[PDB]
Structure 1
Amino acid sequence: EIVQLLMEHEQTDITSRDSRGNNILHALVTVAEDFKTQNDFVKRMYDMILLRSGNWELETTRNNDGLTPLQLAAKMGKAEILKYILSREIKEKRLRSLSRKFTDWAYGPVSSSLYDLTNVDTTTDNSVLEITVYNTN
């Protein structure tokens, strides 16, 4: 409730970056732990905030360590938030451009979905796939 109050407030700045460089999504990633602990309310808040401000601005930024909240979830050990972020299906046709997974065609039970490799597929400098493999911590 308080989150919706603050975002609905016209003066709130959703994209604000704290002293560490983290915006709100980085913060939600550095927190979230596991299902046996938090019962997964962080994924819900992450979705809520993204859908509430339509943009790639939040998820494309970088904290002072030079990481997007996706790459940050890769550096840290957070699987439950990474599955969510890494496959998103947004059903509402307005905000559907924010999804990372799409259904190319579906007929009966058979369906061919489609995934987005931008920061994943290791055509970039440090991607999600290089981190999850070479990260020994």
Structure 2
Amino acid sequence: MRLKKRIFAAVSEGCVEELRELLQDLQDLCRRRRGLDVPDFLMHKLTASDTGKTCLMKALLNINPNTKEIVRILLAFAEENDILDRFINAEYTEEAYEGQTALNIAIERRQGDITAVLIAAGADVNAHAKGVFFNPKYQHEGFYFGETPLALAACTNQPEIVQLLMENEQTDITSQDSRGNNILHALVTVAEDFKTQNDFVKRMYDMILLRSGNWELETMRNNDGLTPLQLAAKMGKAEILKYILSREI
């Protein structure tokens, strides 16, 4: 057998027709003697045992004109077999990329439409990865963004995704990461004294506070005991610091 490898090949090239046929083959196989229950059996067939990469992650890492349809098929298949939540929330197991999920891959790759579907279909909007991105498209691998989907969308200037997540009451907007940083501390780390970005970060900062109403984001302290303003002062970032101060009046 090479069913698993065929399925990874199909989602990677975007062969929608072949994928449907292969997943019918996989369904048929469930009836046969196996050493696992159906959900563990399917998850193994759909997950590289090596790295923990699922075929959903493989699909999002290889964007092509058929990706949205292939994502629909994979989620339908998982849902038909009662493993939708387990499948969509699977995490990389390879140490370097530990904790990365389908949802992080879609956001970093700026796939807003797919991102909305992944969230509605049950992707954990509070999941934190502390490994680096696997094969990121736009950001450096070790890009620091405050370790949440909301903070990832904000720090990469994707305000429609930030708005979608803030409307979702499952999202923990005041979450603090392994540094004790909340989304505003994260924005402070991404700010710089430029002119080409000297817009998006402060606009995002303002939009998050205005739309969330979570004013306490400004007064909560990270592990070094620093509010976002004090973090900007510690980092010697004059411009975002003057922006934050301006909020006082």
**Other-structure match for 2:224:** 65
Query: Counterpart amino acid of 2:174?
Result: T
Counterpart-to-counterpart distance in 1, 2:190 and 2:223: 18
Counterpart-to-counterpart distance in 2, 1:36 and 1:52: 25
Query: Counterpart amino acid of 1:84?
Result: Y
Offset from partner CA, 1:3-35 (integer Å, 9 cap, x none)? 101101111110001011100000000111123
Taking the TM superposition and a 5 Å limit, the aligned residue runs for 1:1-137 are 1-88=160-247, 100-101=248-249
Counterpart-to-counterpart distance in 2, 1:53 and 1:63: 20
The gaps in structure 1 that reach 5 residues or longer are 89-99, 102-137
Cα RMSD, aligned residues only: 1.3
Q: What is the number of equivalent residue pairs in this alignment?
A: 90
Aligned-pair CA distance for 1:37: 4.6
The structure number with the bigger radius of gyration is 2
Counterpart-to-counterpart distance in 2, 1:15 and 1:3: 14
Query: Counterpart amino acid of 1:76?
Result: M
Q: Is the 8 A contact 1:34 1:40 kept in 2?
A: no
Counterpart-to-counterpart distance in 2, 1:40 and 1:23: 20
Percent of paired sites with the same residue: 94
Q: Is the 8 A contact 2:192 2:198 kept in 1?
A: no
Counterpart-to-counterpart distance in 1, 2:219 and 2:198: 27
The 1:35/1:54 distance shift into structure 2, 3 A limit, reads same
Counterpart-to-counterpart distance in 2, 1:12 and 1:38: 26
Deviates more, 1:22-31 or 1:77-86: 77-86
Counterpart-to-counterpart distance in 1, 2:196 and 2:236: 14
Point out 4+ residue stretches in structure 1 off by more than 3 angstroms: none
Please report the TM-score for the alignment, with normalisation by the length of structure 2. Answer: 0.35
Query: Counterpart amino acid of 1:26?
Result: H
**Other-structure match for 1:129:** none
Please state whether the residue corresponding to 2:226 is helix, strand or coil. coil
Counterpart-to-counterpart distance in 2, 1:87 and 1:36: 18
The gaps in structure 2 that reach 5 residues or longer are 1-159
Offset from partner CA, 1:64-95 (integer Å, 9 cap, x none)? 0100001111111212211111012xxxxxxx
Counterpart-to-counterpart distance in 2, 1:61 and 1:14: 12
Please state whether the residue corresponding to 2:195 is helix, strand or coil. helix
**Quick one: higher RCO (CA 8 Å, sep 6+), 1 or 2?**
1
Query: Counterpart amino acid of 1:63?
Result: N
